[PDB]
Design a protein around this ligand. Structure first.
Ligand SMILES: *[C@@H]1O[C@H](CO)[C@@H](O)[C@H](O)[C@H]1NC(C)=O
Ligand SMILES: *[C@@H]1O[C@H](CO)[C@@H](O)[C@H](O)[C@H]1NC(C)=O
Ligand SMILES: *[C@@H]1O[C@H](CO)[C@@H](O)[C@H](O)[C@H]1NC(C)=O
Ligand SMILES: *[C@@H]1O[C@H](CO)[C@@H](O)[C@H](O)[C@H]1NC(C)=O
Ligand SMILES: *[C@@H]1O[C@H](CO)[C@@H](O)[C@H](O)[C@H]1NC(C)=O
Ligand SMILES: *[C@@H]1O[C@H](CO)[C@@H](O)[C@H](O)[C@H]1NC(C)=O
Ligand SMILES: *[C@@H]1O[C@H](CO)[C@@H](O)[C@H](O)[C@H]1NC(C)=O
Ligand SMILES: *[C@@H]1O[C@H](CO)[C@@H](O)[C@H](O)[C@H]1NC(C)=O
Lengths: 509, 509
């Protein structure tokens, strides 16, 4: 309680609780009357570690970057217990019977969540009569009990075409996504089981939603699935499947495995209810392997930014395109640009590096680059360029993380290694991660790629080729240090890389 | 040609060419008459890098650890071209018409391989009349041409039940494994396409074989598949599927994705033909991201050890078992044990570390541990133990790689980071890799696990829980340095880990 790392460590525009522990985001919805985005979260107010009693924390936002934290929304009946993950729906037509005439239809808020008690996980419901700040648990909870220890994380949505509420929920250790239906929110029927992809140890946090295909009238149903432990990257990861849904079973178009975000730190993704126009969601931005040991205090964990989800046909090799999940960050105009560097058609060479030259630093930056690979035979050790994110100098040292692209491998990479920062379970804190991408485009016969990145004091979110792939990782600079400036460098004497466009901004609340 | 790193860098019992570049192993077969294992391989004699003309190199062995290199077996028609990957079968009954009355049935050797020419990849055959040392290409090559640029890596086998030769080959960029049948080895018919798992950039090096289930009469068909680039670990990786095969189509038992080896350096896996009793195979032990840049000379690349493949029902979580691919290394008794450390029931503590104390070092070691996790509440930074593989001291420093287990994560890990060793494309040389495993067993209520590891100068092969998962990685110690001794250490004051059995051996040719 006496050490506060916020000054250098606490994100400006990623949500964090003032104190205590946060994991999975819950009950994501938009209130159309109040015009407020609601974020709830797995919350332990009593320590910077997971533990019971576990609650739903609650915060609101009008723009998905500025958050007001509120009083705890739901709590367990005993210290022995926890209100585990869930989702919220708006029961406009009072199908649940909970709501007065005088409750605004857009605020008829129902939470559906896992109630965790010793040897039992059930699905329970509660309703809010005050706009989502307090709740009354349903008299006849549980609404679903299958006598299981491992039965959690409901995502519920109204399905017009089959005229019912749909729940996807994990039967975690059976590796099944279970699909239930209800008229009621109270009485549920099991319609199907879905099993596929990368099983790890466990299925968690399913989601199922209609995602729009870019430049078209058409859509596909996407099933989201979280697994932890046992990610091939180590620990926790989120995956997806593309297909069709009739209200009863989900049928994927193929049987391939794909991850939502191939950084180490993007887990328990959930989408917002009541979004008109598109699909928005966010995740918990850490990894279960080390999330409770990173050096922040008096809180641990942030969410990712909210992101916009679409589908796009992209080349995965030279011959073949696949319909692929695209995501791009939600950043409203209510963000102040303190300063920016903006350049066009720069021929990058080791004698001409790009260097930010701002007066100060908030620790929040973004960078936005479109680049072209030239025809130049260069030595193997130099077929790359690198973006450096440097702290201020402190113990007469600068800390930095590196983001680059190698043209011989057609792959982006990050290196988040920081010397002299140690914490428990760092054996699992992978430093070097890569992503292979086909060109965004061809200009004549030269390969074009794009990269957008945003750095917020302890988290970096990278989006390659207009969101073709996303990679999210936290990073921990030494005590007192935070991002101060940005450089783009290369070791080539002539130009291998031409940056058609470079924009680097310092940003603030 | 003047620098030779062999002294510290060249494996003793993993095959390497004397000079030049090697990638994928080819034409693996056992000659029953000669009693010789044959290894062919993608070979460039003219540089320590991939390039055309590309040949099949050739080596033989009576025990799968001692290799005799021979003259190039197959070469391209022009410098423009390459004999890409392939397999060998023994046509005992002369179905191909190539073989005399006086050619021993067990030596009726036919190679089936991809002929790579500009804008064209076809499948071609050649036969050997002198036991596999020289070949005559078939008069009417190609045997299969589908007018494709991306059509390569045939694995062929006799399928008794449908009375035909089967070929699995990759239609690389279409992400299809294509299954062809022949009476002939000359005239082929397409029977099915198979598409699943982790797509990556490209399908390569398929395999299809009947694998025995442990302690039973039963078996399953396993389909192997290599992808590169685009492994979720970065670069190249091998995956598999378990199911059934009728000679015409492969039908997996589920749609899950699983990798054969979750280290960075295990690619283009092939099995040996003419193995009676079980399934044996090996891979190329590097990763395409950096294989051509690692600091060895005058050669680059080794194969993995030959491994024995079985299927076993293992716990993937506390509730659920899955039928899972098991592998264990083939190490004959023709291996000399120079010295060994052997201990039983050791309560590991930071005051009582295990330390090898041998007179010298060949650079080749193995370690074999069964251990039990005790009930001891210890601080989070200490819930692990570590195996250290140390070089001799040189520039007044010891280089080392680390292999460990953390009990809070139930996961093994490696850290192959070595200071002051640099080479091109090391951004992709991932240092930290993990593997989550359920307990091998329970002793009362205490968790039991096992680990076998083998280190051979520049390559480490780890096998967790009697081969439940395998992890293969190269490593590059500083100039002159190689493994000299081994330690097992922990930071706990009391004992969290009891090692029921520990055997560390120094080994030699
Ligand atoms: C946990 O937090 C709750 C609410 O802030 C508080 O009532 C309680 O005392 C804390 N600790 C325990 C063990 O309940
Ligand atoms: C789905 O899974 C559960 C196992 O938990 C089983 O009880 C149920 O019968 C299955 N339903 C269908 C439709 O397969
Ligand atoms: C979501 O992205 C989509 C593009 O399909 C757009 O319709 C919508 O306005 C976006 N919402 C936000 C908050 O950016
Ligand atoms: C990065 O580059 C340009 C700058 O206007 C733009 O097309 C693109 O939207 C930028 N990306 C983001 C996410 O702001
Ligand atoms: C079989 O062919 C070989 C190889 O050229 C030849 O030497 C041999 O004499 C032939 N044997 C018979 C029986 O024709
Ligand atoms: C096998 O896939 C090939 C290559 O695309 C295709 O032409 C052929 O029609 C496929 N056959 C079947 C039965 O799917
Ligand atoms: C391969 O391992 C299997 C496992 O039972 C065994 O039957 C066979 O004899 C082994 N062969 C070798 C060379 O280890
Ligand atoms: C290591 O020890 C096990 C169990 O004691 C033994 O059965 C096995 O043969 C050894 N394994 C290897 C790969 O040498």
């Amino acid at each position: 309680l006496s050490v506060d790392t916020s000054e250098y460590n606490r994100p400006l525009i990623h949500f964090t609780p003032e104190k205590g522990w946060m994991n999975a985001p819950n009950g994501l919805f938009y209130d159309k009357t109040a015009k407020l985005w609601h974020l709830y979260f797995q919350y332990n107010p009593n320590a910077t570690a997971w533990g019971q009693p576990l609650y739903w924390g609650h915060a609101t936002s009008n723009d998905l970057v500025h958050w007001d934290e509120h009083e705890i929304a739901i709590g367990p009946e005993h210290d022995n217990e926890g209100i585990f993950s869930g989702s919220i729906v708006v029961d406009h037509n009072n199908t649940s019977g909970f709501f007065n005439s005088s409750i605004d239809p857009n605020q008829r808020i129902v939470a559906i969540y896992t109630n965790n008690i010793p040897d039992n996980q059930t699905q329970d419901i509660a309703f809010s009569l005050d706009g989502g700040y307090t709740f009354t648990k349903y008299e006849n909870n549980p609404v679903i009990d299958v006598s299981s220890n491992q039965f959690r994380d409901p995502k519920v949505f109204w399905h017009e075409d089959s005229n019912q509420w749909i729940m996807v929920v994990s039967k975690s250790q059976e590796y099944k996504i279970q699909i239930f239906g209800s008229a009621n929110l109270k009485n549920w029927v099991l319609n199907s089981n879905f099993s596929s992809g990368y099983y790890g140890n466990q299925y968690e946090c399913p989601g199922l939603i209609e995602v729009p295909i870019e430049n078209s009238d058409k859509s596909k149903w996407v099933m989201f699935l979280a697994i932890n432990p046992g990610s091939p990257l180590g620990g926790s990861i989120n995956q997806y499947f593309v297909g069709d849904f009739d209200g009863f079973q989900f049928v994927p178009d193929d049987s391939q495995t794909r991850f939502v975000d191939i950084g180490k730190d993007f887990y328990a993704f959930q989408t917002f209810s009541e979004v008109e126009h598109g699909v928005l969601g966010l995740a918990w931005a850490s990894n279960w392997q080390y999330a409770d040991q990173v050096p922040t205090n008096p809180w641990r964990s942030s969410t990712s930014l909210a992101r916009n989800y679409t589908l796009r046909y992209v080349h995965t090799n030279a011959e073949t395109k696949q319909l692929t999940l695209i995501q791009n960050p939600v950043l409203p105009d209510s963000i102040n640009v303190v300063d920016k560097l903006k350049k066009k058609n720069v021929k990058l060479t080791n004698k001409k590096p790009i260097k930010t030259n701002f007066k100060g630093s908030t620790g929040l930056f973004d960078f936005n680059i479109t680049f072209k690979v030239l025809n130049l035979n260069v030595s193997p050790g130099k077929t790359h360029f690198d973006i450096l994110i440097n702290s201020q100098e402190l113990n007469s040292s600068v800390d930095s993380i590196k983001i680059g692209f190698d043209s011989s491998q057609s792959s982006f990479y990050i290196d988040r290694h920081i010397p002299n920062v140690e914490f428990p379970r760092k054996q699992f804190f992978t430093d070097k991660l890569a992503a292979y991408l086909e060109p965004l485009d061809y200009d004549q016969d030269l390969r074009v790629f794009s990269l957008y990145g945003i750095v917020d004091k302890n988290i970096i979110e990278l989006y390659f080729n207009d969101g073709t792939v996303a990679m999210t990782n936290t990073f921990f600079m030494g005590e007192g240090k935070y991002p101060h400036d940005i450089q783009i460098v290369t070791d080539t004497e002539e130009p291998l890389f031409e940056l058609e466009s470079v924009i680097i901004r310092e940003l603030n609340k």
